[PDB]
Amino acid sequence: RTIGRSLALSGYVEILPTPFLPAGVFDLWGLEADDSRRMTTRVLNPLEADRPQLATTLLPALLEALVRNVSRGLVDVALFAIAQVVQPTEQTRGVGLIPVDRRPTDDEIAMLDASLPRQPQHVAAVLAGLREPRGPWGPGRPVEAADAFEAVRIIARASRVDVTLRPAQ
Amino acid sequence: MRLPYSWLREVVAVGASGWDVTPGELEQTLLRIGHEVEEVIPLGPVDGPVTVGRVADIEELTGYKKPIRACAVDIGDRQYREIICGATNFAVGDLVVVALPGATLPGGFTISARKAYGRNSDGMICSAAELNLGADHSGILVLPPGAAEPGADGAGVLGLDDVVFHLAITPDRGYCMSVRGLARELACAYDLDFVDPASNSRVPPLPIEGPAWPLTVQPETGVRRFALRPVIGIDPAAVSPWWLQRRLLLCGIRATCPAVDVTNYVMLELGHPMHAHDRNRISGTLGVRFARSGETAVTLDGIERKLDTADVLIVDDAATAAIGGVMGAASTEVRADSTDVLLEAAIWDPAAVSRTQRRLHLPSEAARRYERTVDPAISVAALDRCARLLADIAGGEVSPTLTDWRGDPPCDDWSPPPIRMGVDVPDRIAGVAYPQGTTARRLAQIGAVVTHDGDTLTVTPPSWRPDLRQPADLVEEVLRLEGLEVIPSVLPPAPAGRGLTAGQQRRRTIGRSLALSGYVEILPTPFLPAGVFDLWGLEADDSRRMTTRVLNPLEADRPQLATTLLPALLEALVRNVSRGLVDVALFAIAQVVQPTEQTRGVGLIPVDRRPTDDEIAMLDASLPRQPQHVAAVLAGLREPRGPWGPGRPVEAADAFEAVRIIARASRVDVTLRPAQYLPWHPGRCAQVFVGESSVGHAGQLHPAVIERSGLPKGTCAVELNLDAIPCSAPLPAPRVSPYPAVFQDVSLVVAADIPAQAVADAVRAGAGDLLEDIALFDVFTGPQIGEHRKSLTFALRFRAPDRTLTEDDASAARDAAVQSAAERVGAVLRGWKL
Amino acid sequence: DERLATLRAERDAAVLVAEGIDVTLPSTRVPAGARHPIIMLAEHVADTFIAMGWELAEGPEVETEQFNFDALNFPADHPARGEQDTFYIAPEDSRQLLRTHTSPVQIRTLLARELPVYIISIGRTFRTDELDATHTPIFHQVEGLAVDRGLSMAHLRGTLDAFARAEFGPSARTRIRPHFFPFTEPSAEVDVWFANKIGGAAWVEWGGCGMVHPNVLRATGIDPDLYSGFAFGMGLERTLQFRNGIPDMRDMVEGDVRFSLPFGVGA
Amino acid sequence: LPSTRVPAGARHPIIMLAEHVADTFIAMGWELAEGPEVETEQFNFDALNFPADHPARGEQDTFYIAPEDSRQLLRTHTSPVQIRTLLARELPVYIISIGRTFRTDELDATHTPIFHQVEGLAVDRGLSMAHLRGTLDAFARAEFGPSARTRIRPHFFPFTEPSAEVDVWFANKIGGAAWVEWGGCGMVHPNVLRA
């Protein structure tokens, strides 16, 4: 809740991300073939045959909504989302049926839990166009990478933790 | 109240002999049943040569600052040591207490033979402080003649294995302001038999053959008993035995002479204050009466009191003897030459004494007990106890005369009314099933008369317990004696709550919203600064000046309550600035106090019924208006310095943006209109309307207010009356058209005096639904458009709900909007673009 | 000197008008954003049940078939378990799916905690409906479950009516009409009396409910002869549509900034 | 590089403590009530069973509104808000009142004349001290940790009978878990109910 208030006040508009990735998004990003994000849990009956993989990252859905606002003339946008991703640890292994006339054992639960992919909560955000709009005060400030670092510091302040930023490729 | 464990133990021991307990245990039993032990002082320990000495010779040492004494002291076995001492409260022949070389005093002090002031000193003479026996007063401890021979072991004679419990008794428990009361409490806790130290077996009644002194009593004074007995022919040079001077000292009371000491002693033993009058200094009849307007008495301490017509007095034909229940007077005070004593044993009216003692600032040992009600049934027993003891010490005789006024008509039974309670009501309230008969045994232990009647107890409490008046009172007795620790921890079924209210949510959201934008909340003081409104230059009839005033502030110059929150906000701003925090933005959310008339108070409403709806509305209307306000100040920078650039100093626009933040948080729309209003700057002050109601102001502060107030240049401020911002709960349903949009930029020229929002509204009005968004870009002045005009460039975004807007369709809407601004604010088209 | 400071005054006072400013200028250089309206609906629902002593539970969206169906008393060949109604995780017969309701979270909760259990589970669920103005394949649902001694349908209605009053007004009530759910027995559908508008107070289908099925209790080691229970579930996009009058669900999910901003910040 | 061009502010810590207390009791089914700080003597004292000449009612312990004997004061506890609440609502009543109160203590490192207090009041059929301890222990656990408990020791308040003082077991630190005096409590006095 506090991450949501804190981002919203700073100008971000929450979207509800789709979990179904775009087609070939990672080929668009140029991710290496062994890039962990490519290891996706796949849906077996999507409503779009070209979009059957579940999101291992929230930027695809965020970027999709950003494209929509931009194509409708809303070029100065900052979106954010707070939702789980689906990162699987092996090939889809399913556990067989457990009798329903008794409750499952603590072990049968841990095995059921271990059979499902990792599903951590993520927060994510995108920005484009202006970050400060035009006005009598001056021409405005286009979005810059510094604004995405400041998004980090907003979430960190909201989470009451301290972060460090280190260069990275 | 201080008292020492030995005495407390002695009195419990009468009825449970061999009783004894560690101090730690006692402390814990006292807390467990209701008595706060502020402090436990075991009498500081001594080791080695600390013995009684007799002063045999004093030599006044001249030439120094103080008067100094080189004293020969008989220390036993015909051994005489010289000792240096600075005090003066002792003479040749007095038993003192000496710490000789090799001794160790409390606090880790070793005594050694030390040369001082020109002579050798083999130790020193002690004060009761230095022994950790009693309070430090000036000079050393002197023992009554015959307390001990020289050489006697100090630790034994002083009784330093004693411990002094220092208790903070609660006002409902006055009866525990004595060894009598606490003894009974301890006997109740430990299920011991109790001998009452005021019972006849322990104080046999003295004879009663005639009145001891003439006495008139005006009964509307509140006196419930007034007894006198005389003791004649007492040695005025007699002093009190060591045991009695000691227990006074441990209890906090300095001894003076047997007449006074005996009353203070019996006050501590039984809780009934006493006083001693020099009978030969009484002129004629003793009178109890109210004081008259402007009357005066000088009390024992020789200080003149200005009396009040509600102060009960004791007078005689000559003058005043006693401010009853508070302090005797000089006129009948016992003095050095007093041979014949008349002893006062009275019961005053609790509320009377409380009133009087608070007014005169005389919280005497007598007053504090009478405030909390003294057991009226024991006055003669305390008077008799106190008379025998005086004769016994100072060697007079106790006349068999006795006066004993007990009201008109006389009261012969001091027991309170009986209280009537179900046998298991204590069990309910505690949530515990106590073993059968518990409730009856405990009410018997405190001294009540318990009679059974099926499932319904009839309980007559005893005379020293005027606090036991309903079953709730009886419950607390049972529950505290069994222990509160035995009560379980059961969560109750609480019903479906509705949670927070809209206004409660709105204050939270205003707080989050401002805090995120950089504001730091303060807790505003409600007490205004001195003359703040004279600083602001508010007209004399300025409503803010009409302040509810506090009658006893902690700062005599700051007694008015805030009708506005800016004073406290500005005060905190000054504090941050004076500590080097020049770039600040503070805010507060708190009520103000705006009164509607002169302070009118409503009189008392009976508490045995609930007040009427009308009595509530009258009570509510009697109080000032107290609306919730939100307010904020800003100074210095608003954006700080960094690699991005030099920063942006606070400007009035930032205070308007504070308004828009609170409004967004409140989910209402506001309009800002120019206004002149102090303490704001006249050219930079906006009034805030929700719809057509004023909700407050915002802008930069007046430069002259800033200057007189020692505020930072450019300070901005904002105050809104939250009670004036209505509830809103929108259920929006936004029309989100996907069709493409047309972007056009139009420039309008208008008179400089026209507000930008007027031109925007006119453009919106003329353009209609197609206009999706309008936003002000530029504001340009120059000669070629006219010295008093200005050019507003607006950015317009048109979008249709069902079609791809043509670009003629758009310019239709543009032309329509331009025409509307022409008709409403006289705009002239400068030009347009895309 | 009678008039040295009287024009020295009006000198100073027209300096103050020389530095006047157009107080109506825009001041917002950090435009406000918006938490999404569904999340704020979920927020307001959550607080409504917290305020009644309930707690919220969360869980995975990709979820074992053990907990989505079998523990919730769906037969082994129930229609919902085909590739028509439910998203399934490859490969075929891997007993893994996108959950079609948040009830498994309540099973997980009944396994983990001591009874009594009063739990809300509010989260994203998944059915295979095509996205049109009144259906979304990715929707957010609010489900309750209360298990305790002596619970009855009357308590179900009590909670339902309390819930309705907080989300709709003190004028709001619920009615229940028998229906069928594998999770519950008896089972009803909950219509709500939305007085405040709709253009004219009428009943509206809100969600479903029922007493929790004995078999759900055995599948979680709870004696049905000692404890009973009730449950309910209302879909959030459904509730937003019909309360606010939002003709087109696509607006809720397409992430247009114009849909969200008018709802405000959500702070 | 630093990126924060809009420095973060702060809600005051007392308000956030009040916030966290409020939510703790909301989560248990309670509600919050508010009321005036300048308040009739009817509701501060007489309705709360303070005798007509009680020490607290002198210019020593309580701020009074001019002029003398105008039966108006700065409230010295939030209990009147609960009286007002008991007048206005139907029973049962489970109410928290959290607000600014006023006593005449000089401002030093352990006293403030303007302080913020949290008071509860629960009136219902069959309530007992055991329910008082239940609520107290729940309250303590939320503000201090699951390791926290309360103990009650008899005392005296005019508002309550019996009356106790509440110490809390603050395990999480203090440099070494020890009991600490937290507040007071008690069963509400019959006379407050008649009034």
Side-chain angles (χ1 to χ4, degrees):
Chain A
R1 300 196 175 185
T2 292
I3 290 176
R5 317 203 184 80
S6 290
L7 283 164
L9 267 170
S10 311
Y12 293 80
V13 175
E14 187 170 33
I15 78 168
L16 295 174
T18 177
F20 291 102
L21 288 169
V25 56
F26 300 143
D27 301 314
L28 285 162
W29 293 7
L31 298 196
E32 295 281 324
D34 74 324
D35 195 304
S36 63
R37 281 167 278 188
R38 283 184 188 269
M39 186 185 292
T40 63
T41 284
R42 315 229 171 170
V43 159
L44 193 131
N45 58 325
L47 306 194
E48 253 161 299
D50 49 345
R51 287 172 72 125
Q53 314 184 43
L54 298 191
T56 55
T57 172
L58 292 188
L59 293 183
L62 274 170
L63 286 160
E64 175 156 309
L66 178 66
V67 156
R68 172 171 302 115
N69 290 287
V70 169
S71 68
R72 305 186 172 167
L74 315 175
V75 301
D76 302 305
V77 171
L79 309 172
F80 85 94
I82 294 172
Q84 92 192 22
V85 287
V86 175
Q87 294 159 326
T89 68
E90 41 171 342
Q91 285 302 118
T92 308
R93 177 179 59 85
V95 169
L97 177 63
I98 307 166
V100 303
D101 53 340
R102 61 173 171 90
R103 72 155 277 180
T105 66
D106 289 314
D107 288 81
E108 279 160 337
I109 296 167
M111 197 180 59
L112 283 164
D113 279 356
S115 62
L116 304 172
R118 297 305 94 205
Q119 307 184 53
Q121 294 288 333
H122 280 198
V123 57
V126 290
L127 297 85
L130 296 165
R131 174 74 184 140
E132 167 194 82
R134 190 172 174 180
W137 47 76
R141 187 177 59 252
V143 169
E144 289 303 324
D147 294 301
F149 309 148
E150 176 67 19
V152 171
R153 283 186 233 276
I154 294 170
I155 302 169
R157 289 198 284 265
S159 300
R160 284 205 292 177
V161 308
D162 286 316
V163 286
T164 47
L165 301 176
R166 317 190 182 144
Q169 290 71 230
Chain B
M1 180 175 175
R2 329 182 82 106
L3 81 169
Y5 168 64
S6 51
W7 194 355
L8 195 48
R9 189 207 87 64
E10 178 196 299
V11 180
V12 175
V14 182
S17 44
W19 188 83
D20 199 9
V21 294
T22 169
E25 179 170 345
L26 191 63
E27 176 178 37
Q28 283 301 314
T29 314
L30 284 180
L31 296 159
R32 183 180 90 234
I33 65 173
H35 314 293
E36 185 184 338
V37 183
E38 289 208 346
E39 205 178 356
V40 175
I41 313 291
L43 285 183
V46 300
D47 200 35
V50 175
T51 54
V52 184
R54 174 192 289 139
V55 187
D57 174 13
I58 306 192
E59 173 175 359
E60 300 285 351
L61 295 174
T62 182
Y64 293 73
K65 197 269 162 197
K66 256 166 51 178
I68 305 302
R69 294 179 165 185
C71 313
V73 190
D74 171 6
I75 66 177
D77 294 302
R78 210 172 65 88
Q79 282 313 305
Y80 286 76
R81 305 295 177 265
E82 279 220 340
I83 294 178
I84 300 280
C85 184
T88 60
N89 60 312
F90 66 98
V92 167
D94 271 327
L95 306 177
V96 310
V97 161
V98 293
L100 307 155
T104 38
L105 279 188
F109 297 87
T110 298
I111 320 289
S112 82
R114 291 184 185 101
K115 165 139 186 177
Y117 307 74
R119 319 281 180 85
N120 221 49
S121 170
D122 266 303
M124 52 173 211
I125 300 146
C126 302
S127 71
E130 297 167 305
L131 291 162
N132 193 249
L133 177 73
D136 184 17
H137 279 298
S138 185
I140 55 176
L141 163 68
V142 168
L143 288 62
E149 296 292 338
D153 163 35
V157 172
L158 303 192
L160 302 196
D161 64 324
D162 214 347
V163 189
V164 164
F165 286 64
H166 174 65
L167 298 191
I169 303 296
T170 59
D172 59 325
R173 299 256 198 241
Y175 69 111
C176 314
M177 294 185 68
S178 58
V179 183
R180 180 199 194 196
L182 289 166
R184 207 193 308 275
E185 292 296 283
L186 292 177
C188 285
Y190 288 106
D191 307 291
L192 315 183
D193 274 320
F194 188 67
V195 168
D196 194 337
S199 174
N200 294 336
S201 70
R202 314 283 316 169
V203 171
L206 282 180
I208 303 187
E209 292 155 1
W213 200 263
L215 169 80
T216 75
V217 179
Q218 302 317 313
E220 71 283 2
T221 49
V223 177
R224 301 202 66 216
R225 191 164 194 167
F226 198 106
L228 301 164
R229 201 183 284 272
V231 178
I232 58 183
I234 69 171
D235 193 339
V239 299
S240 304
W242 170 233
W243 64 260
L244 187 148
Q245 297 197 37
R246 177 172 163 276
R247 294 181 170 186
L248 272 58
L249 181 65
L250 292 186
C251 291
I253 302 289
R254 53 215 92 198
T256 46
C257 64
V260 178
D261 301 344
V262 176
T263 71
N264 282 334
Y265 190 86
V266 176
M267 177 201 304
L268 298 162
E269 195 204 353
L270 314 184
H272 193 311
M274 302 282 311
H275 196 248
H277 301 279
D278 186 352
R279 197 183 65 186
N280 303 330
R281 284 172 90 201
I282 303 186
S283 303
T285 311
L286 276 173
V288 184
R289 74 160 164 84
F290 286 104
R292 297 284 171 175
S293 163
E295 216 170 350
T296 282
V298 172
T299 42
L300 299 157
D301 51 30
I303 300 169
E304 192 172 61
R305 312 297 173 184
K306 302 204 184 131
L307 305 197
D308 185 87
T309 63
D311 304 325
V312 177
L313 302 185
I314 299 179
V315 285
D316 68 5
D317 300 345
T320 303
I323 305 183
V326 171
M327 183 176 299
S331 81
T332 66
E333 173 188 20
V334 168
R335 289 176 312 209
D337 60 348
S338 307
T339 67
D340 299 302
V341 159
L342 200 64
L343 288 168
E344 178 205 322
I347 290 293
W348 306 100
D349 169 71
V353 168
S354 181
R355 289 190 290 265
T356 298
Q357 76 89 6
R358 256 99 195 196
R359 213 201 79 253
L360 298 160
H361 305 113
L362 291 178
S364 80
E365 303 271 345
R368 299 192 266 106
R369 299 179 166 73
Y370 286 129
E371 276 177 349
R372 311 167 155 195
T373 319
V374 182
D375 182 8
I378 72 175
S379 310
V380 168
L383 176 68
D384 285 358
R385 167 87 161 88
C386 191
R388 283 186 181 120
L389 183 67
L390 181 54
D392 195 81
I393 300 170
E397 293 177 350
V398 174
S399 293
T401 67
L402 168 66
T403 293
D404 187 33
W405 188 87
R406 310 202 298 298
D408 193 23
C411 195
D412 284 357
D413 192 320
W414 310 94
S415 59
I419 303 166
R420 218 182 162 261
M421 172 187 87
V423 60
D424 71 328
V425 177
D427 308 68
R428 311 210 164 91
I429 302 286
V432 173
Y434 291 113
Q436 189 56 42
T438 295
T439 299
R441 182 179 77 92
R442 293 296 197 179
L443 294 190
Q445 260 177 299
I446 63 168
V449 184
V450 303
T451 79
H452 213 265
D453 199 347
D455 318 299
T456 313
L457 280 179
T458 312
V459 170
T460 292
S463 46
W464 65 85
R465 300 299 303 278
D467 54 320
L468 275 40
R469 284 170 310 242
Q470 311 180 22
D473 299 315
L474 306 185
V475 174
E476 192 198 61
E477 293 309 289
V478 183
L479 264 50
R480 70 185 190 86
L481 287 186
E482 293 290 288
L484 294 196
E485 73 271 0
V486 290
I487 298 169
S489 178
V490 182
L491 269 169
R498 308 199 285 286
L500 299 172
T501 75
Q504 287 166 345
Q505 280 302 153
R506 186 176 62 169
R507 282 182 279 297
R508 300 196 175 185
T509 292
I510 290 176
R512 317 203 184 80
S513 290
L514 283 164
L516 267 170
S517 311
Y519 293 80
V520 175
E521 187 170 33
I522 78 168
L523 295 174
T525 177
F527 291 102
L528 288 169
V532 56
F533 300 143
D534 301 314
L535 285 162
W536 293 7
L538 298 196
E539 295 281 324
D541 74 324
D542 195 304
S543 63
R544 281 167 278 188
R545 283 184 188 269
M546 186 185 292
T547 63
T548 284
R549 315 229 171 170
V550 159
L551 193 131
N552 58 325
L554 306 194
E555 253 161 299
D557 49 345
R558 287 172 72 125
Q560 314 184 43
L561 298 191
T563 55
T564 172
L565 292 188
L566 293 183
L569 274 170
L570 286 160
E571 175 156 309
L573 178 66
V574 156
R575 172 171 302 115
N576 290 287
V577 169
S578 68
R579 305 186 172 167
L581 315 175
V582 301
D583 302 305
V584 171
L586 309 172
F587 85 94
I589 294 172
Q591 92 192 22
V592 287
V593 175
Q594 294 159 326
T596 68
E597 41 171 342
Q598 285 302 118
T599 308
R600 177 179 59 85
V602 169
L604 177 63
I605 307 166
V607 303
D608 53 340
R609 61 173 171 90
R610 72 155 277 180
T612 66
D613 289 314
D614 288 81
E615 279 160 337
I616 296 167
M618 197 180 59
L619 283 164
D620 279 356
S622 62
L623 304 172
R625 297 305 94 205
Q626 307 184 53
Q628 294 288 333
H629 280 198
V630 57
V633 290
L634 297 85
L637 296 165
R638 174 74 184 140
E639 167 194 82
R641 190 172 174 180
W644 47 76
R648 187 177 59 252
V650 169
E651 289 303 324
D654 294 301
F656 309 148
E657 176 67 19
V659 171
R660 283 186 233 276
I661 294 170
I662 302 169
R664 289 198 284 265
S666 300
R667 284 205 292 177
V668 308
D669 286 316
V670 286
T671 47
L672 301 176
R673 317 190 182 144
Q676 290 71 230
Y677 189 70
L678 289 177
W680 276 276
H681 182 306
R684 313 186 159 181
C685 172
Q687 191 181 359
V688 188
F689 293 92
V690 164
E692 293 295 337
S693 309
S694 174
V695 291
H697 303 84
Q700 183 187 334
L701 288 196
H702 202 294
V705 184
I706 275 173
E707 197 284 338
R708 305 200 272 274
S709 306
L711 299 185
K713 291 224 178 187
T715 308
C716 303
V718 53
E719 193 159 13
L720 305 187
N721 169 5
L722 283 188
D723 283 21
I725 297 177
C727 181
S728 61
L731 297 177
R735 302 197 266 278
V736 188
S737 170
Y739 293 93
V742 194
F743 297 86
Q744 285 187 19
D745 289 3
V746 73
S747 308
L748 292 174
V749 174
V750 290
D753 295 303
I754 299 262
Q757 187 69 56
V759 190
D761 287 357
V763 165
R764 197 181 300 155
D769 280 358
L770 293 199
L771 195 76
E772 189 186 68
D773 181 80
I774 175 181
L776 178 58
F777 281 176
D778 305 348
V779 174
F780 277 116
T781 75
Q784 65 280 344
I785 65 169
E787 183 196 7
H788 299 290
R789 329 184 74 200
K790 70 194 180 183
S791 161
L792 300 189
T793 309
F794 287 84
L796 309 156
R797 187 167 76 224
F798 307 101
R799 188 194 314 265
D802 60 0
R803 61 186 187 282
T804 283
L805 204 70
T806 68
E807 175 169 349
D808 292 337
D809 279 350
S811 304
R814 191 188 67 261
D815 291 339
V818 169
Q819 177 61 229
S820 185
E823 307 159 348
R824 283 167 191 221
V825 296
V828 185
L829 183 76
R830 194 153 217 265
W832 63 286
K833 199 189 112 212
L834 312 85
Chain C
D1 201 353
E2 313 93 353
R3 281 199 42 166
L4 173 140
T6 199
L7 277 170
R8 179 147 303 258
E10 316 185 356
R11 171 192 64 101
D12 278 343
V15 173
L16 294 201
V17 312
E19 69 196 19
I21 60 160
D22 182 349
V23 300
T24 71
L25 289 160
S27 66
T28 302
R29 296 173 78 154
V30 182
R35 300 178 74 203
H36 195 279
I38 299 289
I39 299 304
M40 307 304 305
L41 187 53
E43 201 153 282
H44 190 295
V45 178
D47 287 0
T48 285
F49 280 94
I50 288 298
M52 292 199 296
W54 294 55
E55 281 186 32
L56 283 64
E58 301 153 319
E61 292 161 353
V62 177
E63 166 72 81
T64 71
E65 194 166 337
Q66 181 58 56
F67 284 157
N68 203 31
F69 290 137
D70 296 306
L72 295 174
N73 203 62
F74 285 70
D77 294 280
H78 185 276
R81 298 169 92 140
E83 277 182 27
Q84 297 286 138
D85 305 332
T86 286
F87 285 116
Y88 284 97
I89 316 290
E92 281 153 60
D93 316 300
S94 65
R95 282 176 68 75
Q96 202 158 97
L97 49 77
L98 278 168
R99 56 172 190 198
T100 50
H101 50 298
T102 64
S103 307
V105 180
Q106 305 167 4
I107 308 291
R108 306 206 171 235
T109 308
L110 283 194
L111 292 177
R113 289 146 166 247
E114 298 303 293
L115 294 162
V117 165
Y118 290 74
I119 192 75
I120 285 293
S121 62
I122 291 173
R124 192 161 69 163
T125 61
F126 312 80
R127 304 216 304 139
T128 47
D129 304 348
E130 280 290 4
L131 174 77
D132 57 43
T134 48
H135 304 88
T136 179
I138 300 104
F139 68 109
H140 294 84
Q141 221 195 346
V142 47
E143 300 186 54
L145 168 65
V147 186
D148 200 343
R149 285 182 217 257
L151 286 192
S152 58
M153 291 279 289
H155 304 123
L156 166 54
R157 306 203 61 162
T159 304
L160 278 170
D161 289 325
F163 184 11
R165 283 192 297 265
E167 293 303 316
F168 295 106
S171 61
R173 195 185 63 150
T174 74
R175 75 180 181 202
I176 56 171
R177 170 163 63 65
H179 195 54
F180 170 81
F181 301 96
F183 181 23
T184 53
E185 181 100 356
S187 309
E189 289 204 286
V190 194
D191 302 325
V192 64
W193 178 243
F194 176 24
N196 277 12
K197 214 136 68 179
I198 202 183
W203 293 96
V204 187
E205 176 179 332
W206 196 10
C209 64
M211 299 297 286
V212 64
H213 190 319
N215 288 359
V216 180
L217 295 186
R218 312 217 189 62
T220 49
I222 298 146
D223 190 343
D225 290 11
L226 295 162
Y227 299 185
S228 52
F230 69 77
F232 52 91
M234 291 77 168
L236 286 184
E237 279 85 352
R238 174 57 181 171
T239 283
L240 192 64
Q241 190 161 52
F242 86 72
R243 185 193 73 180
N244 292 35
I246 301 185
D248 199 345
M249 283 208 197
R250 280 180 286 259
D251 285 336
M252 302 185 190
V253 310
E254 280 179 343
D256 199 307
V257 288
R258 289 171 307 175
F259 181 67
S260 291
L261 292 196
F263 283 84
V265 173
Chain D
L1 289 160
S3 66
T4 302
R5 296 173 78 154
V6 182
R11 300 178 74 203
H12 195 279
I14 299 289
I15 299 304
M16 307 304 305
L17 187 53
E19 201 153 282
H20 190 295
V21 178
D23 287 0
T24 285
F25 280 94
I26 288 298
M28 292 199 296
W30 294 55
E31 281 186 32
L32 283 64
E34 301 153 319
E37 292 161 353
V38 177
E39 166 72 81
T40 71
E41 194 166 337
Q42 181 58 56
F43 284 157
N44 203 31
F45 290 137
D46 296 306
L48 295 174
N49 203 62
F50 285 70
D53 294 280
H54 185 276
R57 298 169 92 140
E59 277 182 27
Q60 297 286 138
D61 305 332
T62 286
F63 285 116
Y64 284 97
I65 316 290
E68 281 153 60
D69 316 300
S70 65
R71 282 176 68 75
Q72 202 158 97
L73 49 77
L74 278 168
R75 56 172 190 198
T76 50
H77 50 298
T78 64
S79 307
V81 180
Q82 305 167 4
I83 308 291
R84 306 206 171 235
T85 308
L86 283 194
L87 292 177
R89 289 146 166 247
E90 298 303 293
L91 294 162
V93 165
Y94 290 74
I95 192 75
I96 285 293
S97 62
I98 291 173
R100 192 161 69 163
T101 61
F102 312 80
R103 304 216 304 139
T104 47
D105 304 348
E106 280 290 4
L107 174 77
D108 57 43
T110 48
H111 304 88
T112 179
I114 300 104
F115 68 109
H116 294 84
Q117 221 195 346
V118 47
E119 300 186 54
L121 168 65
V123 186
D124 200 343
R125 285 182 217 257
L127 286 192
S128 58
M129 291 279 289
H131 304 123
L132 166 54
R133 306 203 61 162
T135 304
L136 278 170
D137 289 325
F139 184 11
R141 283 192 297 265
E143 293 303 316
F144 295 106
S147 61
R149 195 185 63 150
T150 74
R151 75 180 181 202
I152 56 171
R153 170 163 63 65
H155 195 54
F156 170 81
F157 301 96
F159 181 23
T160 53
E161 181 100 356
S163 309
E165 289 204 286
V166 194
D167 302 325
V168 64
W169 178 243
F170 176 24
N172 277 12
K173 214 136 68 179
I174 202 183
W179 293 96
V180 187
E181 176 179 332
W182 196 10
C185 64
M187 299 297 286
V188 64
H189 190 319
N191 288 359
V192 180
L193 295 186
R194 312 217 189 62

